[PDB]
Symmetry: C3
Subunit: 173 residues, 3 copies
């Protein structure tokens, strides 16, 4: 994307990662292998670090930030849905963060979790593995089905391929 350093920090971006030139990555941000950051997404690492694990995607118009003492750590095969916002939270592996949802400071999202579109996970809220979270404040309404569990990985894999397609075939006109 448009990539920036701020005072002593430069983003650490794996060569295989896709960062749309219209995305904004600033400071203390780590993007691992096969990650992807889409148009208009903002990863502002000007306070605590923002870490994005392997095979994870940060979709269009998403914002990721932190609070003092609350870094944002994202696991592997994580899908951060369009227009969602993650703030100073810990997100496990195989997690689908719903479109336009919000994850607040201190929250701990387990593995194989789906956060519904528009849901808001309150500060310090701990979400167990295999949970479906809906509402504002977000509640665990039930456990995921086998189909949804397979989807928590599939969604991310689709993006890994999409990222490569953009890396190789995008052309500004």
């Amino acid at each position: 994307m448009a990539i920036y350093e701020i005072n002593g920090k430069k983003p650490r971006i794996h060569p295989s990662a896709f960062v749309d030139e219209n995305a904004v990555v600033i400071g203390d941000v780590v993007l691992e292998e096969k990650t992807s950051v889409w148009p208009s997404a903002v990863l502002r690492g000007d306070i605590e670090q923002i870490y994005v694990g392997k095979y994870s995607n940060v979709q269009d118009n998403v914002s990721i930030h932190t609070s003092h003492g609350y870094p944002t750590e994202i696991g592997e095969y994580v899908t951060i849905g369009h227009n969602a916002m993650v703030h100073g939270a810990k997100v496990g592996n195989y997690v689908i963060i719903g479109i336009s949802s919000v994850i607040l400071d201190g929250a701990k999202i387990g593995d194989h979790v789906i956060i519904g579109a528009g849901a808001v996970v309150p500060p310090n809220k701990e979400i167990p593995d295999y949970s479906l979270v809906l509402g504002v404040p977000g509640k665990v309404v039930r456990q995921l089905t086998e189909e949804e569990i397979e989807w928590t990985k599939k969604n991310a894999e689709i993006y890994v391929e999409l990222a490569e397609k953009h890396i190789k075939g995008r052309k500004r006109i």
Copy 2:
């Protein structure tokens, strides 16, 4: 906006359309006559096509995407509110998509419909004509009034004029 092709697809944009240079239009996207795409809006046509009918506007920080087998088709005189997100859905004519609302895959929004701000239309949800939709999950709470019906067109017309004003009078400083 910042316009891009991806592998064999180039956006088809009508000469009268306004696409803010800060918007992002990629791939298989069709923008008809008198449409407008505002700052920070993202129309990513990298899977299925995104079609935007005549006199329709896609406001600031909006994201439009699709899923395999689920293209996004927008009708005429449609207002896609600031920060809203439309994903693989069919939207009819004279529809006001509320600010920061979400329309999910397979949804079919009828004509002369108003989706409230922050509402979430679930996947495959069918919304009848003349409906007011509120909530998460979005429910049809009542039919529109005559004033609201006239507004479903007026809102779009205001934007058609606004688009022309920007086309002719915008200047970067």
Copy 3:
């Protein structure tokens, strides 16, 4: 940010304000001393004026707009959270607009108010001072605590310092 005039209006920006180059400021917009506009934020002053008072911040992916007869006026020490949207509303001093929340036309937000993440303040809704607002439609659920009241200022002060850090230490790479 990317700054623009539209027909006779040029933004009035105080020398001390920070406007990220990835933000979009258009037309009739006033940004006072020590204000800050972050990446992907959009302040579109193409209808009525958008005024942002001293020490206030407009975070990443936020959109601010107006309606005919409804300008947007923001007071001092106001924090407009990531991905929030303010439309033709009046916001007082020491107000925290929650992440991904929505403030609609004609709304009047009092001083020392916290709007919860994802909440939607309905058109013409008046929120009294020292209120905590939650829900859709947004309701005053209780008065703020002393800690929250001190936070309504602290949040903004953190940003004033952050803005200066970016003004002096940002570097594109």
